[PDB]
């Protein structure tokens, strides 16, 4: 069941970019080198914590194993905003809170009360409406 | 006789509000499979997000996604 | 008697059904009529409560091998013809030529028989795109057969 290949495309230029020696190899240096390219660069412990996780020497053959499994099944931003679309007839870009807990929780592949707890602790939902739009943005980022 | 007689017009409205409940169901599938894949990806894309979002290879991936 | 792609059929949308009331390899009781409607026959509810059907959500539920012996006890429902069709709303035409009035409409479909809510007799309406005249009648020959013919 998968993976697409644009995402093994995308995982590829991750590990391309990462890899600042085009060694082909992710090292401490690669990573560190990406850190501090992108904000704060977190100390030696959490990044050899980081490249222990991979058996081996980090190929992108080693990167893919490290990611494929938990990427497998995730898609796109526009596909989710289209998937929360299909419950939004009108296209007013929200969803009333109760209707979207109704869907999660009682319907397809249940929510339990531990993952509807963590879903909607940081939800953007005002006025009854939920910000599925921005929640997407959310659930891609940071 | 005419009990008989009012009997049958009332199922024969019944069978009539039988098929427009059918029409109506039968409207409504294509749409019923459309949103089945949809949360399918909602519930799917709410739960890989919710592992990986406190793994820290995640928050490196994530940053460089936008600069691909 | 029951057609392996008929099965087939019954299989892809009792799933679809499953999945909707949370996917456990079950179906509502209470859905069994809407199931069997996807499949393109048009039960009385007196004829899906006959076969096990609930009038609730949450007090039975149904594994495909359940379920198989019900559609199969509901596909020889008798089923309307348009000869019944018109020769009932002949009944209400006070003139014979074909009209009734909107308000007419309204009493036989949601005030008669299994009544409809008015929430679905706006819906069929609606899909059916049947319009009143300045006096409000409309020709229950053309909603007749808009209704009999289907969505597609
Ligand atoms: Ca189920
Ligand atoms: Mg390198």
């Known amino acids: 069941a998968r993976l697409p290949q644009k995402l093994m495309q995308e995982m590829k230029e991750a590990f391309t970019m990462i890899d600042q020696n085009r060694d082909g190899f992710i090292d401490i240096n690669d990573l560190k080198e990406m850190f501090s390219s992108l904000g704060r660069t977190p100390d030696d412990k959490e990044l050899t914590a980081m490249l222990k996780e991979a058996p081996g020497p980090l190929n992108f053959t080693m990167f893919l194993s490290i990611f494929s499994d938990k990427l497998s099944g995730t898609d796109s931003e526009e596909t989710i905003r289209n998937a929360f679309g299909m419950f939004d007839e009108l296209d007013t870009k929200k969803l009333n809170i109760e209707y979207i807990k109704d869907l999660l929780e009682n319907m397809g592949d249940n929510f339990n009360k531990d993952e509807m707890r963590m879903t909607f602790k940081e939800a953007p939902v005002e006025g009854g409406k939920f910000d599925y739009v921005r929640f997407v943005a959310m659930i891609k980022g940071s | ?68 | 008697k029951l057609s392996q792609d008929e099965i087939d059929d019954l299989k892809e949308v009792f799933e679809l059904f499953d999945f909707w009331d949370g996917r456990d390899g079950a179906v509502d009781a209470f859905k069994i009529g809407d199931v069997c409607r996807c499949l393109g026959i048009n039960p009385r509810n007196e004829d899906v409560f006959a076969v096990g059907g609930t009038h609730k959500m949450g007090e039975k539920s149904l594994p495909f091998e359940e379920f198989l012996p019900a559609y199969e006890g509901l596909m020889d429902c008798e089923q309307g013809t348009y000869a019944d069709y018109m020769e009932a709303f002949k009944t209400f035409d006070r003139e014979g030529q074909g009209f009734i009035s909107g308000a007419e409409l309204r009493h036989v479909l949601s005030g008669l028989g299994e009544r409809l809510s008015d929430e679905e007799v706006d819906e069929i309406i609606n899909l059916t795109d049947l319009q009143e005249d300045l006096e409000g009648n409309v020709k229950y020959e053309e909603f007749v057969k808009k209704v009999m013919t289907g969505p597609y």
Request: hydrophobic share 45%.
């Open chain 2, 1 to 68: 006789l005419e009990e008989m007689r009012d009997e049958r017009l009332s199922k024969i409205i019944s069978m009539f509000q039988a098929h427009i409940r059918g029409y109506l169901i039968r409207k409504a599938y294509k749409k019923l499979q459309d949103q089945r894949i949809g949360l399918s990806v909602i519930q799917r894309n709410i739960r890989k997000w919710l592992v990986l979002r406190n793994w820290q290879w995640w928050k490196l991936y994530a940053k460089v996604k936008p600069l691909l």
